[PDB]
């Protein structure tokens, strides 16, 4: 199957440059043009540029000429976007995508990378702090993890190493007056299972190297 | 550039009903060979965009046949003939005739029956109290519609300016929402008060529901 593999979330300081990659697989990278698309948080999509991996020819959205530089390494089936002179406006998710072809094949983007989220900030990375929301008492109880004071985004939360998916609700992070992010994950469970089933939230921060496993026990 | 105006921008639809999205172009989309490179993408909550329709009307493989796209020149349309719960997302049109551009996006939300929240209230953990701050968390689970009013009352006194809330995306199965309000205090303030309540007003509730606890039980 066709897959585009993009690295995880990256934190970069203002004014520097960042080069994000995109590994093509399940097809031969030179057979298809590639687009890069930008999506700012809560904003529409925006086309940056198109590369032809066969001969490296590029075409740019005028708003990104001088800001983005698409290249390709054929030998390793990887395409790259470099952004220069990073500002806060360059904080967004960046997608690489494959173009079907031309004419009656369509110029559409048929496969998409999962996107590389980019935070541009002078602030240093900080890991989170994980506190438990313990249950107290129709046969339905709630428990969860408070994940507090981390930066940058994002943090991911599974329950029991992903063996507990139904019922969970991982809220969008909120930005506190501290300038640090905070979010909570909850899950609804049967009251009878509290003394019998252990509940562990797997919280996980990639910008720092923090990885915390908290047992949520009833007080 | 070419501006792709989409109408409507918000599309509340019932499950089972038809739903249409218009996409107007400032320029006529037609290269010399006669091709209109107009596509439609769907972005579901927390996911990459995915192709739906390309070349105006060709349906990308895997897309159910409920999705169809028509149009010529500068007017285009996307139709979902029978809407499922798992079709919630933002719908984008896209042209590649000139320098490529997206439409603003149409947010399709599922219209479902009113459902009243389960409300849960969590005191701060002792680890948090031993660290100087106190977060109190009010949970509203699986409710509809989105708008909810959560009021904090410490010692029967209405709080203001010290709470934050966030709301999950519409669930792709039961089409409901969930909300969390967090009252954030210093440890010292948390200890100058006994009763901590959150008070929930919602269309699914005939009377406001309050859940509370006493610091120290």
């Amino acid at each position: 199957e066709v897959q585009l593999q993009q690295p995880g979330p990256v934190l970069v300081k203002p004014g520097a440059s960042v080069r994000m990659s995109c590994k093509a697989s399940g097809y031969r990278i030179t057979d298809n043009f590639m687009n890069w698309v930008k999506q700012s948080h809560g904003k529409s999509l925006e086309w940056i540029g198109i590369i032809n991996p066969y001969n490296g020819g590029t075409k740019y959205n005028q708003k990104f000429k001088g800001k983005a530089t698409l290249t390709v390494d054929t030998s390793s089936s990887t395409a790259y976007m470099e952004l220069n002179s990073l500002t806060s406006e360059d904080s967004a998710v960046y997608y690489c995508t494959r173009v079907r072809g031309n004419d009656y094949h369509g110029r559409a983007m048929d496969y998409w990378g999962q996107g590389t989220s980019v935070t541009v900030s002078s602030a240093s990375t900080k890991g989170p702090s994980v506190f438990p929301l313990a249950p107290s008492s129709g046969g339905t109880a709630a428990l969860g993890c408070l994940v507090k004071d981390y930066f940058p985004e994002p943090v991911t939360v599974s329950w029991n190493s992903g063996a507990l998916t139904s019922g969970v609700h991982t809220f969008p992070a909120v930005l506190q007056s501290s300038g640090l992010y905070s979010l909570s994950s909850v899950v609804t469970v049967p009251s009878s299972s509290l003394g019998t089933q252990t509940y562990i939230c797997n919280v996980n921060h990639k910008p720092s190297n923090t990885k915390v496993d908290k047992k949520v026990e009833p007080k | 550039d070419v501006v792709l105006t989409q109408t409507p921008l918000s599309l509340p639809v019932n499950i089972g009903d038809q739903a249409s999205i218009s996409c107007k172009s400032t320029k006529s989309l037609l290269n010399r060979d006669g091709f209109t490179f107009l596509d439609w993408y769907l972005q579901k909550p927390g996911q990459s965009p995915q192709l739906l329709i390309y070349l105006v009307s060709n349906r990308f493989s895997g897309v159910p046949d409920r999705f169809s796209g028509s149009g010529s020149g500068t007017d285009f349309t996307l139709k979902i003939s029978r809407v499922e719960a798992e079709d919630l997302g933002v719908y984008y049109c896209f042209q590649s005739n000139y320098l490529f551009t997206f439409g603003s996006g149409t947010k399709l939300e599922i219209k479902r029956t009113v459902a009243a929240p389960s409300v849960f209230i969590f005191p701060p953990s002792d680890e948090q109290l031993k660290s100087g701050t106190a977060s109190v968390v009010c949970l509203l689970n699986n409710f509809y519609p989105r708008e909810a009013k959560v009021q904090w009352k410490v010692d029967n006194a209405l709080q203001s300016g010290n709470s934050q809330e966030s709301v999950t995306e519409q669930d792709s199965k039961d089409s409901t929402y969930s909300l969390s309000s967090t009252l954030t205090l210093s440890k010292a303030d948390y200890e100058k008060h006994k009763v901590y309540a959150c008070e929930v007003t919602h269309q699914g509730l005939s009377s406001p529901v309050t859940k509370s606890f006493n610091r120290g039980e």
């Binding site: 001969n55 020819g57 075409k59 031309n102 | 290269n31 010399r32 590649s96 000139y98 320098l99």
Partner: peptide, 14 residues
């Protein structure tokens, strides 16, 4: 216009 320039780009096979 840009529509033609994009058409030459896509058909370029050098």
């Amino acid at each position: 216009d840009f529509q033609d320039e994009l058409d030459e780009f896509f058909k370029n096979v050098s």
